[PDB]
Amino acid sequence: EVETFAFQAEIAQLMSLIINTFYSNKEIFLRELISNSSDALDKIRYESLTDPSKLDSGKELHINLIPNKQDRTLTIVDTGIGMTKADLINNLGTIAKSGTKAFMEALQAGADISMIGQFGVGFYSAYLVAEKVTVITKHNDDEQYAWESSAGGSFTVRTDTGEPMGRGTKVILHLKEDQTEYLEERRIKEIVKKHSQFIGYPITLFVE
């Protein structure tokens, strides 16, 4: 059923640093995740140029932001390329061992955490606001998996027996009890206007 994995030592370190370093500009987490979704959307778009049957699983390419105040979650859904099980396990598709090394070396050279996505490890900036991230993903090659962590050096992967999604990745952020501002419609609008105003796919902010 549930398989448990250890983060590579470097990714464990990165995460600890994101959770432990005092850093007020937490909002950048949404830019990082939107831009991840935008990159995955490019990949399914590039691939459908040569093989247009890859879109049999969803012809519409978009990003949705779903806050839910009861569950204290913000969900970023994209209909991008999705991850195989192998991708999930290899640090959600990233070059995370050397991306972290490069990042922790930019840090001790005049850079701040906001430059995280330049090293290809943006996803972990989710840990700025979330106490637990759950990642549901579906690639055309493979079945649907749920990936999950509350940091602490381990993550779980299970085949997700719940709701089919067709193709893409849903990042569910279970927010820290003091970061509920990121559930407010006004707050989300502002961040999307400020950090992601020129992203080439519809972004849709759901209402409650």
Ligand X SMILES: CCC(=O)c1ccc(O)cc1O
- Residues interacting with ligand X, by CB under 6 A? 33, 36-37, 40, 78, 80-83, 87, 92-93, 123, 137, 169, 171
Residue 70 or 84 with smaller CB distance to ligand X: 84
Residue 17 near a second copy by CB under 8 A: no
CA atoms of 95 and 109, how far apart (whole Å): 21
Q: Which of 106, 150, 174, 181 binds a second copy (CB under 8 A)?
A: 106
**Phi then psi dihedrals of residue 19, to 5 deg:** -75, -25
Partner in contact with 205, chosen from ligand X, a second copy, none, beta carbon below 5 to 8 Å by kind: none
CA atoms of 89 and 189, how far apart (whole Å): 33
Residue 58 near a second copy by CB under 8 A: no
20 annotated to bind ligand:
no
Nearest in space to 169 (alpha carbons), one of 132, 207, 140: 140
Least distance in angstroms from the C-beta of 73 to ligand X: 15
State the DSSP H helix or E strand holding residue 6, giving kind and residue range, or none if neither. strand 3-6
Residue 24 or 50 with smaller CB distance to a second copy: 50
CA atoms of 18 and 54, how far apart (whole Å): 36
Q: Which of 75, 90, 114, 150 binds a second copy (CB under 8 A)?
A: 90
Query: Residue 63: CA atoms inside 13 Å, Cβ hemisphere, count?
Result: 25
Is 122 within 8 Å of 33 (Cβ atoms)? yes
123 annotated to bind ligand:
yes
In this structure, the strands spanning 73-78 and 168-175 are antiparallel
| Binding interface with a second copy (CB under 8 A) | 42, 45-46, 49-50, 86, 90, 93-95, 98-99, 101-103, 106, 109, 111, 115, 118-120, 197-200
* Binding-site sequence positions: 36, 78, 97, 123
